[PDB]
Design an enzyme around this catalytic site. Structure first.
Site, PDB file in Angstrom:
ATOM      1  N   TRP A  75      67.901   7.493   5.934  1.00 43.73           N
ATOM      2  CA  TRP A  75      68.898   8.590   6.285  1.00 43.73           C
ATOM      3  C   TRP A  75      70.340   8.187   6.399  1.00 43.73           C
ATOM      4  O   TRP A  75      71.310   9.055   6.301  1.00 43.73           O
ATOM      5  CB  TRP A  75      68.460   9.237   7.622  1.00 43.73           C
ATOM      6  CG  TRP A  75      67.005   9.692   7.485  1.00 43.73           C
ATOM      7  CD1 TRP A  75      65.897   9.087   8.003  1.00 43.73           C
ATOM      8  CD2 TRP A  75      66.532  10.770   6.659  1.00 43.73           C
ATOM      9  NE1 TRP A  75      64.739   9.789   7.609  1.00 43.73           N
ATOM     10  CE2 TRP A  75      65.120  10.819   6.785  1.00 43.73           C
ATOM     11  CE3 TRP A  75      67.180  11.761   5.883  1.00 43.73           C
ATOM     12  CZ2 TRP A  75      64.346  11.775   6.124  1.00 43.73           C
ATOM     13  CZ3 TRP A  75      66.421  12.707   5.222  1.00 43.73           C
ATOM     14  CH2 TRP A  75      65.000  12.705   5.347  1.00 43.73           C
TER      15      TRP A  75
ATOM     16  N   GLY B 267      71.463  16.469   9.300  1.00 44.08           N
ATOM     17  CA  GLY B 267      72.025  15.391  10.004  1.00 44.08           C
ATOM     18  C   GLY B 267      72.724  15.805  11.288  1.00 44.08           C
ATOM     19  O   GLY B 267      73.743  15.181  11.708  1.00 44.08           O
ATOM     20  N   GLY B 268      72.277  16.921  11.871  1.00 47.15           N
ATOM     21  CA  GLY B 268      72.851  17.322  13.158  1.00 47.15           C
ATOM     22  C   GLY B 268      74.301  17.733  13.035  1.00 47.15           C
ATOM     23  O   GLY B 268      74.954  17.773  13.988  1.00 47.15           O
TER      24      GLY B 268
ATOM     25  N   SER C 117      67.238  21.258   8.125  1.00 48.66           N
ATOM     26  CA  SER C 117      67.684  20.945   9.491  1.00 48.66           C
ATOM     27  C   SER C 117      69.077  21.501   9.665  1.00 48.66           C
ATOM     28  O   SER C 117      69.260  22.741   9.572  1.00 48.66           O
ATOM     29  CB  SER C 117      67.603  19.433   9.774  1.00 48.66           C
ATOM     30  OG  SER C 117      67.640  19.134  11.195  1.00 48.66           O
TER      31      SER C 117
ATOM     32  N   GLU D 233      57.448  18.568  13.745  1.00 58.38           N
ATOM     33  CA  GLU D 233      58.898  18.503  13.896  1.00 58.38           C
ATOM     34  C   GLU D 233      59.384  17.522  15.008  1.00 58.38           C
ATOM     35  O   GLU D 233      60.280  16.680  14.804  1.00 58.38           O
ATOM     36  CB  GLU D 233      59.412  19.933  14.148  1.00 58.38           C
ATOM     37  CG  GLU D 233      59.225  20.893  12.916  1.00 58.38           C
ATOM     38  CD  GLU D 233      60.170  20.553  11.765  1.00 58.38           C
ATOM     39  OE1 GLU D 233      60.996  19.622  11.937  1.00 58.38           O
ATOM     40  OE2 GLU D 233      60.099  21.191  10.701  1.00 58.38           O
TER      41      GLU D 233
ATOM     42  N   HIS E 231      59.493  15.645  11.005  1.00 61.29           N
ATOM     43  CA  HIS E 231      60.729  16.247  10.555  1.00 61.29           C
ATOM     44  C   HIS E 231      61.362  15.430   9.461  1.00 61.29           C
ATOM     45  O   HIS E 231      61.574  14.197   9.668  1.00 61.29           O
ATOM     46  CB  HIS E 231      61.669  16.219  11.740  1.00 61.29           C
ATOM     47  CG  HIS E 231      63.025  16.783  11.452  1.00 61.29           C
ATOM     48  ND1 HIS E 231      63.254  18.134  11.372  1.00 61.29           N
ATOM     49  CD2 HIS E 231      64.234  16.178  11.293  1.00 61.29           C
ATOM     50  CE1 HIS E 231      64.554  18.340  11.168  1.00 61.29           C
ATOM     51  NE2 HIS E 231      65.173  17.168  11.157  1.00 61.29           N
TER      52      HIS E 231
HETATM   53  P1  TN6 Z   1      68.742  17.989  11.752  1.00 65.37           P
HETATM   54  O1  TN6 Z   1      70.029  18.027  11.046  1.00 65.37           O
HETATM   55  O2  TN6 Z   1      67.901  16.713  11.543  1.00 65.37           O
HETATM   56  N1  TN6 Z   1      68.893  17.978  13.273  1.00 65.37           N
HETATM   57  C1  TN6 Z   1      69.186  19.245  13.887  1.00 65.37           C
HETATM   58  C2  TN6 Z   1      70.286  18.936  14.937  1.00 65.37           C
HETATM   59  C3  TN6 Z   1      67.926  17.096  13.972  1.00 65.37           C
HETATM   60  C4  TN6 Z   1      68.790  15.865  14.605  1.00 65.37           C
END
Ligand code: TN6
Ligand SMILES: *[C@@H]1O[C@H](CO[C@H]2O[C@@H](C)[C@@H](O)[C@@H](O)[C@@H]2O)[C@@H](O[C@@H]2O[C@H](CO)[C@@H](O)[C@H](O)[C@H]2NC(C)=O)[C@H](O)[C@H]1NC(C)=O
Ligand SMILES: *[C@@H]1O[C@H](CO[C@H]2O[C@@H](C)[C@@H](O)[C@@H](O)[C@@H]2O)[C@@H](O[C@@H]2O[C@H](CO)[C@@H](O)[C@H](O)[C@H]2NC(C)=O)[C@H](O)[C@H]1NC(C)=O
Ligand SMILES: *[C@@H]1O[C@H](CO[C@H]2O[C@@H](C)[C@@H](O)[C@@H](O)[C@@H]2O)[C@@H](O[C@@H]2O[C@H](CO)[C@@H](O)[C@H](O)[C@H]2NC(C)=O)[C@H](O)[C@H]1NC(C)=O
Ligand SMILES: *[C@@H]1O[C@H](CO[C@H]2O[C@@H](C)[C@@H](O)[C@@H](O)[C@@H]2O)[C@@H](O[C@@H]2O[C@H](CO)[C@@H](O)[C@H](O)[C@H]2NC(C)=O)[C@H](O)[C@H]1NC(C)=O
Ligand SMILES: *[C@@H]1O[C@H](CO[C@H]2O[C@@H](C)[C@@H](O)[C@@H](O)[C@@H]2O)[C@@H](O[C@@H]2O[C@H](CO)[C@@H](O)[C@H](O)[C@H]2NC(C)=O)[C@H](O)[C@H]1NC(C)=O
Ligand SMILES: *[C@@H]1O[C@H](CO[C@H]2O[C@@H](C)[C@@H](O)[C@@H](O)[C@@H]2O)[C@@H](O[C@@H]2O[C@H](CO)[C@@H](O)[C@H](O)[C@H]2NC(C)=O)[C@H](O)[C@H]1NC(C)=O
Ligand SMILES: *[C@@H]1O[C@H](CO[C@H]2O[C@@H](C)[C@@H](O)[C@@H](O)[C@@H]2O)[C@@H](O)[C@H](O)[C@H]1NC(C)=O
Ligand SMILES: *[C@@H]1O[C@H](CO[C@H]2O[C@@H](C)[C@@H](O)[C@@H](O)[C@@H]2O)[C@@H](O)[C@H](O)[C@H]1NC(C)=O
Ligand SMILES: *[C@@H]1O[C@H](CO[C@H]2O[C@@H](C)[C@@H](O)[C@@H](O)[C@@H]2O)[C@@H](O)[C@H](O)[C@H]1NC(C)=O
Ligand code: NAG
Ligand code: NAG
Ligand code: NAG
Ligand code: NAG
Ligand code: NAG
Ligand code: NAG
Ligand code: NAG
Ligand code: NAG
Ligand code: NAG
Ligand code: TN6
Ligand code: TN6
Ligand code: CL
Ligand code: CL
Ligand code: CL
Ligand code: CL
Ligand code: CL
Ligand code: CL
Ligand code: CL
Ligand code: CL
Ligand code: CL
Ligand code: NA
Ligand code: NA
Ligand code: NA
Lengths: 527, 527, 527
Positions: free
Chosen positions: A80, A114-115, A196, A323, A436
């Site tokens: 990642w 990526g949050g 995500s 998840e 996830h």
């Molecule tokens: P995603 O972008 O992986 N995420 C939602 C905040 C999980 C860290």
């Protein structure tokens, strides 16, 4: 040689052999002025026009961002992390086209997760050359600004308005509208897809008036804007912007001065302070994310959803069976990717403190009450399994199911999947199950590459998803029509039918996590 | 004198007395550049513009094609062979208009069949002067390229892209859009109609984005693109294009060179080798037909049908009671047009090998199982009758019924006929019954010509069909409203009502060949 | 002074006091070139443009036509004869506008009846000044050519194409489209209304593509194009055109010469021969009427009706209780307006011969069978009452009810009235009851003029109809909403609810003449 003329100049791509065939790839096309100096924290500014040939022959810089250093040398985590240089000069995109040049191809636009603090379009698991080769769609992906650089907000003020990184995605959807016919693409058939935070992004472009006419359909993998991590409040955003200033000695009194000061800081100083803008966070912290800015987002998006104020079109929405698990090794007591992580009741309890920081005590007892009525109290992995379900049900699964319901109540076809297959090549341990992030390589077709050590049942599984994803994009209907496949029913309130994706048999089921999500959805928001 | 001005020049037609009245006929109008030399195997190129008067006073050259030599001197077969010179310079069309010049007439555009390997618009059974006279519609027909010259495919490559002959039809629909008002015609009311491969053609123009706005409604007589003979796979098309090259010593390694070599060949050399591009074929072989080319056809058309991706409009779809019989004298053991053709079980069996070449043994036993559960084993014409039903149910009837169902499931009105009348003048023997191809002369009104030795009940029968065909075209509803006629119900999934066309009494019935087509449709595609 | 500027010139109107108020009237505005000389029998040609002020201050010439001489000095008959000079120069119209000039008034366009052989817009019963005053709509009426001059047909040939007089009405609807805003009128809200042949006219403009966009809604009083007298066949029209030629020594062999010869004839010679173009006719003969010309009318209009090919809009359709009676004094044995007309069975029988000339004997017995099953055979006015019902049910009532059903089956709102009030001032005897033609003065409001010797209940009755007619025109709904009036239900197939119009109580009823019209409608067309 392959040169395409764009509105801002010519671009040269490169040929690639994929599966005894050829895809043309234009990696690294710029789509805005670099957001440096005076432009830092501002809305992306359109691109100037260049004579000569821009060479789109490698991936570009990824946007500045903190990196996951928890498991150095470990592929599960490091797959990642960014794989091109970081730089503020990261406003680039990628186009992959079938060879020969298609005539009026459907377009799939990927938005990474990526949050909102990390990520990049150039990861191996986002490589759209298999989709182009296999389904003859065009794949587009874009880098957009993450962290404070992309989401710092001082509401109302164009020097740092908020949501810049959503504006980066937008300006990229625009470049596709203006430029993709040149490449053989149909601007009138564009489907956004993302995972995500990238999926939450897709769901907000469904809500944004400025994005309405820059795409046709949406796919949301493990994410939607109603997830608890997805939208920062005005309250919190200010606190955070001021906390950031404070930490970089940039406290001023003229907010326009706070920003000018922050623009003198150097990217690392900013990055280095992000994690502490909050008294405590969690492994799921989104310090600088989307805010209601009165521009991209005109009102709290829960209100827009409830009251039917979004683009009317089909959606495909999905989640994975486990998840929550991936987050438990980033700070929950007794968890480790290097053992079976049987934790205790008291560990489960300390873990809720990890994930539910403030967090009435009664709130947390209520989670424990709901999730620990064992059947029965014998099983040693009881509390380990409950913590992960807690985390993924709260953060991903129920908010995706609630989005799908509410969206569908306004009349549009919606399809919901439950992804249950664990990768034969997963580096994370078995107990973390169907994690996830691990459907993505199936969606992108990486298992169609036989050179690659996935099982046969995995090739077949991914070929089918690719086909369903592509039929959804071209035709608004995620069916695999040729191979006696289970038919994918629309999701309705009332029935809530969803389709399970796994190697053995796919099923039609109903009301995923009905009991759990009644909890997260009706009760918890009250505590 | 009758001169009409067209976008490319003036054209002179000729007057014809039909039934104490007059039709103007413009036979032989060119509609594209001749596809010779450099243009062989390419998409038709638009026509240049000529000053002076083009004389449209006789039928033009038919496209190059192999001829049926099985029954020399026999009218049954030779009525289908071309009746104007063959030449590659065959891209012409015919217009018949009522006299006096109509004001805004509905247009019927005929597309002939012939397996995509043969046929021509100038056959006597396609003469639209009766329709013009009797119904005051305009009739248009066109020649288009058949065989390798019209359908050779080397996918993606414009020197031989595939589907040229479908592009010829298209460019003709275009000429009608631009030119037919000049003739008194309404471009906004055009109905395509065609038989067998010509009907499959009509069904693919329902699927082709480029044809969507070049017509209003469609009629499909004994044919649809889901028939097993109607679309060549990419696999098979390449094999065949390379096999063709090989047979003409044109094997190269640069596919663009294969084609340049093939363009040096002379039409006969090409024609002469077509039959052998396949290890074995059948009397129903379509060596060079429509392919998925990413241009005319964007995806397998079964997928487009299933997922509702076709022009939304009314369709009229029909078949004849004994579709299969005509094929049995072209290679099935024990069959002959010169005797009653009582074959044996072992003959039936060898015949399945004729029609079902590769062709698991179990596939063929399964056909025998389904079709030979006699009621009862006494009747000597049992196996003769079963072979023909096999052939026509597999090739025509079930695929037309499945097309009609699927099409209608998307909301459009659809009407299905079962043609059961045997021509009083049929030259083929009685046992071949109501043959493939023998409704056409009723549709075109040949029995309205009393000079002509058809019974009285046949005139009445054809007058009625003409009226229903014309009402369908002008009004989307194939009713004969004046003469206490049986009302023709729409075809719905669920009821599947169809109308029977015969001299005695027409009926409303339901679910034609329900048991047979469950077999062809659900089971056989699996073997 | 009141001058309005039109597209072709200025026009001066005159003021009128009506009911202590004022209406402006522009009587006699020309709307086409006079159809004299070379123009006789041709489509109206548009009007040239005149500088200076055209004075629209009196009614213009009525079109040439035979006159009813049956009852000289008798007001009942002579009220229908023309009241301005006859001349071929009769292509004029009338506009009545409220004072003050309305801003965007709804327009009612009147089309008179008279069998297509007679009539004129300037009759006292067609005076629209009451409608303008009372409802503040604009009233327009037009003269159009009747008899051979207006409907002579030699099909296909523009020297005498047919339907000229329908083209006159059309060109008038056009003048309203271009000119009526100038007068304060809304071209986007125009309702056509007309009685008897004028109603059949309204129903054919519902069928004519050229009229579709020249009006909004239609009202049909005692007439529709499916009435047996309303459309001349191509067969009959030719016979009649040739019979006319023959009678004026104009038989030629070049049909264009027949016409040139007929254009040398003088109006009287033509008029004088019309009655004999048919071997026999009836009091209801329409020697020269609408034909299928392929221009105004593109197909038999029964076919257009059945198959839903008409403008989609609301209709109001009505008939009177004794449609048939008025015709019985024009040739039925034993009838007279000067006595009670008790006829005998044998008289009834000879009368069917009068009205049903050819006319199988069994046809006529069948009418007698249906209409003479007495209940019971005692009543002396039995056969007198049956002959009139026969005539009005066949000619008006059932065809209006069948039009209304069929029209409504395509989805539009339709309202049907049954007019049952006999005028207190009717000059015809009592036995003729509620006669054809005698609702018109109620529709036009003549009973609102108290100076005038109608009862009080008649003023109220007419005020209500005016209000319903005007609400229909402006709002598509013929309700009288203020005075606790019976609500007028839409007419549906299935229920066939209609509203009765009379002085006592208006009712909702269902299925007017169900038993009679089953006869005329299903059975009789067969004989
Ligand atoms: P995603 O972008 O992986 N995420 C939602 C905040 C999980 C860290
Ligand atoms: C809104 O922000 C204030 C700021 O507090 C922070 O100072 C930052 C620069 C950063 O270092 C951060 O870690 C630090 O906490 C928050 O106030 C703090 O809140 C916690 C708990 O309430 C206290 O223990 C701190 O002492 C307190 N700090 C100060 C100086 O007031 C505040 O909590 C925050 N709101 C939230 C909960 O997000
Ligand atoms: C599974 O491992 C966890 C993680 O902690 C450890 O990682 C191990 C693989 C090993 O290297 C160990 O030394 C390292 O600390 C264990 O949780 C830990 O439990 C230990 C035992 O005292 C505590 O000291 C730690 O506080 C705790 N770590 C944290 C910070 O969470 C866990 O006990 C082990 N359990 C098994 C085998 O199920
Ligand atoms: C795809 O094409 C090959 C080509 O084979 C053919 O060679 C052509 C030029 C022509 O003459 C044709 O009749 C001939 O068969 C096919 O290979 C052939 O297949 C059959 C049965 O498999 C064999 O008996 C032949 O020996 C074999 N030929 C060679 C040289 O390999 C192949 O079958 C074909 N695919 C199909 C079934 O359509
Ligand atoms: C019906 O005729 C078929 C066709 O074969 C023949 O055509 C006949 C009209 C006659 O001219 C005959 O000589 C010609 O060969 C007959 O099938 C044939 O059966 C014969 C008998 O041995 C065989 O020799 C052939 O293999 C076979 N022909 C083929 C290639 O199909 C058939 O027997 C005859 N049957 C009847 C009368 O029902
Ligand atoms: C079509 O027209 C012919 C013409 O007959 C007519 O001659 C006209 C000029 C006129 O004077 C008219 O009154 C006269 O009848 C019709 O032929 C006539 O039909 C009747 C009954 O069939 C006979 O008794 C006449 O003798 C006969 N005349 C001739 C000269 O042939 C014919 O009937 C008509 N069709 C209809 C019924 O409308
Ligand atoms: C009602 O009057 C009709 C009409 O005929 C007559 O009109 C009367 C008012 C009177 O002037 C009379 O002389 C005139 O002829 C009568 O029908 C007539 O009946 C008479 C009696 O013989 C016959 O001679 C006529 O053929 C017939 N006229 C026609 C051509 O229809 C009717 O008898 C009379 N009946 C009543 C009073 O009910
Ligand atoms: C390409 O097709 C265009 C429209 O195709 C799309 O229609 C949209 C409404 C949407 O449904 C998409 O999913 C469809 O595929 C057409 O208007 C363009 O002209 C075409 N362009 C070409 C062939 O150059
Ligand atoms: C001819 O009629 C035109 C439209 O007629 C058609 O309407 C289409 C939508 C389709 O339903 C057809 O079946 C109809 O017949 C009209 O717009 C043209 O202007 C007309 N042209 C003339 C008379 O010149
Ligand atoms: C007058 O009103 C115009 C439209 O009014 C009509 O709308 C039509 C569709 C029809 O329903 C009629 O019955 C309505 O009354 C409007 O567009 C014009 O601009 C207006 N003109 C004026 C006031 O000058
Ligand atoms: C683009 O790449 C090609 C490689 O053939 C070459 O023309 C040139 O070096 C490049 N242009 C640059 C480096 O700006
Ligand atoms: C704050 O000072 C800055 C200096 O640029 C300026 O942006 C802004 O106008 C000032 N705001 C006020 C009015 O205090
Ligand atoms: C359909 O089936 C074939 C053969 O059984 C297989 O190779 C292919 O993977 C399938 N295609 C899809 C879209 O799943
Ligand atoms: C077209 O035909 C007519 C016949 O009258 C004549 O003008 C001429 O011969 C023709 N033109 C040619 C043959 O090109
Ligand atoms: C093959 O050679 C031909 C000669 O015209 C040409 O069409 C094509 O560019 C060549 N393809 C390649 C790159 O091998
Ligand atoms: C309708 O009926 C007539 C006479 O019965 C007949 O001549 C004609 O063929 C029929 N028309 C149609 C459209 O079938
Ligand atoms: C129109 O009428 C007025 C009456 O005032 C007058 O100007 C003139 O006489 C008329 N014009 C004519 C008669 O052409
Ligand atoms: C008939 O002669 C007339 C004279 O004007 C003319 O209208 C027409 O062309 C002629 N028709 C024919 C060709 O006989
Ligand atoms: C409504 O009622 C009043 C008084 O009762 C009456 O004068 C008038 O005629 C009525 N209006 C209509 C539209 O019938
Ligand atoms: P049609 O064109 O006759 N055909 C379908 C292939 C039968 C040979
Ligand atoms: P109408 O115009 O009065 N009419 C229909 C023919 C009755 C003579
Ligand atoms: Cl247990
Ligand atoms: Cl499946
Ligand atoms: Cl569950
Ligand atoms: Cl038997
Ligand atoms: Cl019938
Ligand atoms: Cl059957
Ligand atoms: Cl009685
Ligand atoms: Cl009332
Ligand atoms: Cl009644
Ligand atoms: Na609770
Ligand atoms: Na089976
Ligand atoms: Na009867």
């Amino acid at each position: 040689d392959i040169i395409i003329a764009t509105k801002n100049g010519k671009v040269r791509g490169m040929q690639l052999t994929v599966f005894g065939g050829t895809v043309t790839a234009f990696l690294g096309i710029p789509y805005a002025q670099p957001p440096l100096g005076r432009l830092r924290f501002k809305k992306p500014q359109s691109l100037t026009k260049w004579s000569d040939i821009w060479n789109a022959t490698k991936y570009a810089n990824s946007c500045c961002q903190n990196i996951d250093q928890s498991f150095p040398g470990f592929h599960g985590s490091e797959m990642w992390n960014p794989n091109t240089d970081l730089s503020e000069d990261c406003l680039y995109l990628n186009v992959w086209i079938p060879a020969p040049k298609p005539k009026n191809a459907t377009v799939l636009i990927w938005i990474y997760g990526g949050g909102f603090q990390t990520g990049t379009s150039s990861l191996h698991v986002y490589d759209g050359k298999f989709l182009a080769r296999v389904e003859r769609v065009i794949v587009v992906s874009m880098n957009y600004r993450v962290g404070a650089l992309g989401f710092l907000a001082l509401p109302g003020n164009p020097e740092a308005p908020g949501n810049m990184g959503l504006f980066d995605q937008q300006l990229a959807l625009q470049w596709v509208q203006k430029n993709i016919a040149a490449f053989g693409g149909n601007p009138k058939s564009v489907t956004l897809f993302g995972e995500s935070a990238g999926a939450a992004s897709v769901s907000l472009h469904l809500l944004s008036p400025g994005s309405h006419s820059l795409f046709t359909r949406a796919i949301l993998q493990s994410g939607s804007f109603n997830a608890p991590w997805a939208v920062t409040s005005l309250y919190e955003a200010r606190n955070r912007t001021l906390n950031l200033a404070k930490l970089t000695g940039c406290s001023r009194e003229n907010e326009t001065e706070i920003i000018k000061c922050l623009r003198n800081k150097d990217p690392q100083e900013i990055l280095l302070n992000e994690a502490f803008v909050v008294p405590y966070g969690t492994p799921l912290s989104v310090n600088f994310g989307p805010t209601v800015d009165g521009d991209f987002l005109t009102d709290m998006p829960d209100i827009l959803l409830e009251l039917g104020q979004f683009k009317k079109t089909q959606i495909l929405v999905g989640v994975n069976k486990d998840e929550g698990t991936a987050f438990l090794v980033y700070g929950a007591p007794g968890f480790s990717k290097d053992n079976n992580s049987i934790i205790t009741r008291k560990e489960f309890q300390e873990g809720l403190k990890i994930f539910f920081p403030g967090v009435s005590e009664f709130g947390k007892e209520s989670i424990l009450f709901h999730y620990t009525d064992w059947v029965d109290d014998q099983r040693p992995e009881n509390y380990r399994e409950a913590l992960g379900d807690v985390v993924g049900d709260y953060n991903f699964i129920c908010p995706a199911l609630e989005f799908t319901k509410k969206f569908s109540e306004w009349g549009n076809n919606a399809f919901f999947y439950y992804f249950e297959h664990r990768s034969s090549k997963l580096p994370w341990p078995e107990w973390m199950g169907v994690m996830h992030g691990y459907e993505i390589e199936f969606v992108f077709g990486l298992p169609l590459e036989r050179r690659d050590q996935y099982t046969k049942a995995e090739e077949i599984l991914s070929r089918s998803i690719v086909k369903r994803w592509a039929n959804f994009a071209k035709y608004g209907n995620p069916q695999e029509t040729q191979n006696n496949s289970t038919s994918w029913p629309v999701f309705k309130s009332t029935e809530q039918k969803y389709l399970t994706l796994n190697t053995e048999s796919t099923r039609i089921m109903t009301k995923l996590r009905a009991q759990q999500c009644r909890f997260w959805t009706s009760f918890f928001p009250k505590v």
